[PDB]
Amino acid sequence: MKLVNFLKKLRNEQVTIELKNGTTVWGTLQSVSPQMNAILTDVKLTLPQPRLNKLNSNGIAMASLYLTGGQQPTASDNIASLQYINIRGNTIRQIILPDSLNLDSLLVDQKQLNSLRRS
Amino acid sequence: IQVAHSSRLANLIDYKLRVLTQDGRVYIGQLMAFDKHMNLVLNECIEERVPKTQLDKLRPRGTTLNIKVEKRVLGLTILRGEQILSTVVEDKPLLSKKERLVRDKKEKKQAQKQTKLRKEKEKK
Amino acid sequence: GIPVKLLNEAQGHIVSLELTTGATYRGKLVESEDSMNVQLRDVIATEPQGAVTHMDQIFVRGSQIKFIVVPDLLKNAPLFKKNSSRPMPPI
Amino acid sequence: SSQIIDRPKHELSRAELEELEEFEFKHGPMSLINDAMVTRTPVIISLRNNHKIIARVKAFDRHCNMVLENVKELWTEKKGKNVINRERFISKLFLRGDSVIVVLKTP
Amino acid sequence: MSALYFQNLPSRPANKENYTRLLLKHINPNNKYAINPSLPLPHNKLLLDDQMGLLEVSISRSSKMTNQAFLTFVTQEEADRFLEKYTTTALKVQGRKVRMGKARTNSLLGLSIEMQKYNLDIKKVLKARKLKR
Amino acid sequence: VSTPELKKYMDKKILLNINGSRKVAGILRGYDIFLNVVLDDAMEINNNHQLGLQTVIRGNSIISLEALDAI
RNA sequence: AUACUUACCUUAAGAUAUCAGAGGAAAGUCCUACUGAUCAAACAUGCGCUUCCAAUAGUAGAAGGACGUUAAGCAUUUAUCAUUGAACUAUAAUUGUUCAUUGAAGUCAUUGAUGCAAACUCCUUGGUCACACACACAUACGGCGCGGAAGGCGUG
RNA sequence: UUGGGGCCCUUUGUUUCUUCUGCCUGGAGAAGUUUGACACCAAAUUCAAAUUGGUGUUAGGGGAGCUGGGGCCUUUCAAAA
RNA sequence: ACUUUGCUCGUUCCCGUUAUGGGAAAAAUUUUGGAAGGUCUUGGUAGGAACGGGUGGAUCUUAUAAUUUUUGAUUUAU
RNA sequence: UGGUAUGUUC
């Protein structure tokens, strides 16, 4: 069992990848590499403010969003809408999956089932 | 600019990338090569960073924000993959896809001729 | 892979590398490794808050490197060629 | 059994590798997560960014990455005197394994 | 309600939303709409597109009339005041100067403003069916 | 994998920055393939207090290792 | 070029789309110029598909730069630490202030740095194509000239 | 074949496919086109030539045949009604 | 569902008769598949097939979650 | 059954 082979099965679905910065990437997912290198397409990077007034946020990730090139210049919040982002795998903390997909079809490892039938 | 939906980092050779690193710095340059560890080689990449003084203009509240960005110029650098965080595409290649095809067929011809020559020369 | 081999092309030429601490170093590249350990010679060293000194040699562990800047002619190196044909290797 | 555990993994055959993975998940430290996968009891997982999730494990993995359903994330945020408890409900979630610190099986 | 007529505009912008916003920048730079891209433009069917009187633009792709366009304004007077803004100095969009004059026929949206100041639509649609003949 | 190329730095005085702040200077006696290094008569440069007769440093924590001698 | 002399080497394994069905060498294996379904690649080929393609009826303009000038622009802010002696204020071991002496380090800059803003000059880039100098439009606008660039989707 | 009009020549090594002849009162002439030719780089013999080792170039447009694909039309055949 | 039976309706033809029944079949129409021909367009024009190996390179799996890249010390924290 | 490298001889 490697859950990366689970995650490769998704391949056309709106996910939200929450990275270790705090930045969250919402978008249609294309392929996933065997090191969890997500490639999303129609993405909407955003950085959630912490709802308490005095607390700032990540400052480095503010710089990273502006420097992507996609921040809307009139925009109030840190959002950056950009076609084609590519994400190196060690950055992903968690991936918010869609509500609709059935886990009990997808989590069946074909290779584990293959060996277990064979042996 | 629109990028093909099934375009992996092997397709995007000679496009102009926008690589983002962990310390908040953006590297912009023509992509030359990549590797298993995802460490790029960028041809005319120019580093940019947001200074700590300009940074509080990014914080959520004029209409458009204006950020003076400290940029250094470096050329033919190799990045290290450990630092890379995400890459975005900025500009298409110089040559068109058709014209790129023409160049590749030409180069295959010339290379095959040269190794045919080197073989027949080592025979005599 | 190609980037590590490009670093091997640059031996004996002035390279500039910035470490992950923030320091910058510019000097001749004497030796480099497959792990990216580099040894610079006659090196001008800029510390993160900006002080510059001169070092005779330095060995940096390649894990600490952010980037390396090699000479600009090496874009014409032959390892970047896509269409290339080999002479049928011997026994 | 014990001999495959003690031997270095570069020597072991492919079937021995698959056998060792089943053995370490059945009789091991990650066996805890496995029991909560099968007995369908919630677990409390404490992450590296100081968030605590309460969830049920739908599948888990060698690196302790786990697919979770009915995820509830709890966190607190503080500046000076001020502190706020924030909580969020997510239906289905993938969790990469490197963030986890401790996983507790709820009685 | 009087629509101005413009000749000698550039015919390569293509998309109407892009064409209206670029024109409207060359009309009144640092407009509200022109300096915020990805705002919706108002569609005002029988919300001023721009203050100081500008109500809609109306272009077509019909190969008879490429470069010509029609700006309709709020009232009869702003139509004459707009010519006053030029003050005998020609406005230029891109590299070409735009000759402009009040139209030989008032705009349809202008007729809707004056009539409110549907039988007309019946007449126009019957005109269209007669021109389809 | 491959041992680092420090055969020329043996038995010479050397200054290396442990982590990002500490700076330790000693005589290099041995090295490993992780760039562990053991140097005799170390001192921690700031007054600077000596460490001990024989120290090893985990090369995870070494950044750079310039040599304060001939080579 | 030959030849001879040495010196340094002479290796991680495995695999080549998936699922189901028929056949051949009760469990599984292997195979089938076998057969379905899915996937992926190439090549043709289309969509009233979507975006973009620069004055000459003129001396322009668009996109991106400048590691360009005005420019010492305009407004703020920075330039060591320890020891000893002397005067000095003082609630005071002398905390404050000034002058000299020994030692220790010390990126250059102060015409700098940082904040703000404007004018000007110049570089690269492009169909500077063809037919037109035209009264349109509510179902809002014949998207009914030839190409090119880039994607989306479909078929073979 | 000759003349006239328009536009272009920065084609800057004056058409840039190569060589050779050649040009502004002109847009031209000869030979050649891939196991080949041509241009250029580096050396050392003690100038040049010689060779060995290298990097490139061999193009753009139109036509006839031959052939892959689509759209539309005709005929003929089969099953769906 | 198959087989026999008369009745009612019916695309086309014939007959008993034009009440209606009997018999025949798409031979008239359409859609689907294929062959040939015409027209218009768009692309190619010097290599291609088959066999082969102590042949190169991509992708994938496993060593590999244990200091040198991807299974967390850069949300500045108490 | 090899490769690269080195220098000598002709």
Swiss-Prot record, chain A:
Coiled-coil residue spans: none
Q: What superkingdom heads the lineage? A: Eukaryota
* Location(s) in or outside the cell: Nucleus; Cytoplasm
Keywords of this protein's UniProt record, alphabetized? Cytoplasm, mRNA processing, mRNA splicing, Nucleus, Ribonucleoprotein, RNA-binding
Where does this chain mainly localize?
Answer: nucleus
A single Gene Ontology CC term: cytoplasm
Residue ranges of domain Sm in the record: 2-101
Q: Which one of the record's GO molecular function terms can you name? A: RNA binding
GO BP of this protein: 7-methylguanosine cap hypermethylation; mRNA 5'-splice site recognition; mRNA splicing, via spliceosome; spliceosomal complex assembly; spliceosomal snRNP assembly; U2-type prespliceosome assembly
Which miscellaneous remark does the UniProt record hold? Present with 2400 molecules/cell in log phase SD medium.
Q: What does the entry's free-text domain comment contain? A: C-terminal extension may function as a nuclear localization signal (NLS).
- What function does this protein fulfil? lays a role in pre-mRNA splicing as a core component of the spliceosomal U1, U2, U4 and U5 small nuclear ribonucleoproteins (snRNPs), the building blocks of the spliceosome. Also binds telomerase RNA and is required for its accumulation.
Give the UniProt family note.
Answer: Belongs to the snRNP core protein family.
Quaternary structure?
Answer: Component of the Sm core complex, present in spliceosomal snRNP U1, U2, U4/U6 and U5. The core complex contains SMB1, SMD1, SMD2, SMD3, SME1, SMX3 and SMX2 (Sm proteins B, D1, D2, D3, E, F and G, respectively), and is probably a heptameric ring structure.
Protein's UniProt name: Small nuclear ribonucleoprotein Sm D1
The record's gene field reads SMD1
Q: Which residues of the full protein are shown?
A: 1 to 119 of 146
From Swiss-Prot, chain D:
Q: Give the main location.
A: nucleus
User: Do you know which SMART domains this protein is assigned to?
Assistant: Sm
Q: Residue ranges of the Sm domain? A: 30-107
Assembly notes:
Component of the Sm core complex, present in spliceosomal snRNP U1, U2, U4/U6 and U5. The core complex contains SMB1, SMD1, SMD2, SMD3, SME1, SMX3 and SMX2 (Sm proteins B, D1, D2, D3, E, F and G, respectively), and is probably a heptameric ring structure.
PANTHER family annotated for this entry?
SMALL NUCLEAR RIBONUCLEOPROTEIN SM D2 (PTHR12777)
Question: Any further remarks?
Answer: Present with 799 molecules/cell in log phase SD medium.
Designated name of the protein: Small nuclear ribonucleoprotein Sm D2
Organism, by scientific name, is Saccharomyces cerevisiae (strain ATCC 204508 / S288c) (Baker's yeast)
Name of the coding gene? SMD2
UniProtKB/Swiss-Prot annotation, chain E:
Q: Which domain of life is it from?
A: Eukaryota
Please list the residue ranges annotated as the RRM domain. Answer: 2-105
Q: What does the annotation say about its assembly with partners?
A: Component of the spliceosome where it is associated with snRNP U1.
Q: What else is known?
A: Present with 2950 molecules/cell in log phase SD medium.
The protein here is known as: U1 small nuclear ribonucleoprotein A
Record localization: Nucleus
Native species of this protein?
Answer: Saccharomyces cerevisiae (strain ATCC 204508 / S288c)
Tell me which family the UniProt entry assigns to this protein.
Belongs to the RRM U1 A/B'' family.
What does this protein do, in the record's words? Involved in nuclear mRNA splicing. The principal role of the U1A is to help fold or maintain U1 RNA in an active configuration. It is the first snRNP to interact with pre-mRNA. This interaction is required for the subsequent binding of U2 snRNP and the U4/U6/U5 tri-snRNP.
Swiss-Prot record, chain F:
The subcellular localization recorded is: Nucleus; Cytoplasm
Q: Which domain of life is it from?
A: Eukaryota
Please provide, in alphabetical order, the Gene Ontology terms of the cellular component aspect for this entry: catalytic step 2 spliceosome; commitment complex; cytoplasm; nucleus; precatalytic spliceosome; SMN-Sm protein complex; spliceosomal complex; spliceosomal tri-snRNP complex
Keyword annotations of the record: Cytoplasm, mRNA processing, mRNA splicing, Nucleus, Ribonucleoprotein, RNA-binding, Spliceosome
Q: Name one Pfam family in it.
A: LSM
Q: Name one GO biological process term.
A: mRNA splicing, via spliceosome
Give the molecular function GO annotations.
RNA binding
Where mainly located? nucleus
Gene3D superfamilies from the UniProt entry: 2.30.30.100
- Domain (Sm) spans 1-71
What function does the entry list?
Plays a role in pre-mRNA splicing as a core component of the spliceosomal U1, U2, U4 and U5 small nuclear ribonucleoproteins (snRNPs), the building blocks of the spliceosome.
What quaternary structure, including any partners, is listed in this protein's UniProt entry? Component of the Sm core complex, present in spliceosomal snRNP U1, U2, U4/U6 and U5. The core complex contains SMB1, SMD1, SMD2, SMD3, SME1, SMX3 and SMX2 (Sm proteins B, D1, D2, D3, E, F and G, respectively), and is probably a heptameric ring structure. SMX2 specifically interacts with SME1.
Xref: PANTHER family: SMALL NUCLEAR RIBONUCLEOPROTEIN, SMALL NUCLEAR RIBONUCLEOPROTEIN G
Q: What else is known?
A: Present with 1400 molecules/cell in log phase SD medium.
**Could you say which protein family the record assigns here?**
Belongs to the snRNP Sm proteins family.
Can you name this protein? Small nuclear ribonucleoprotein G
Q: Which organism is it from?
A: Saccharomyces cerevisiae (strain ATCC 204508 / S288c) (Baker's yeast)
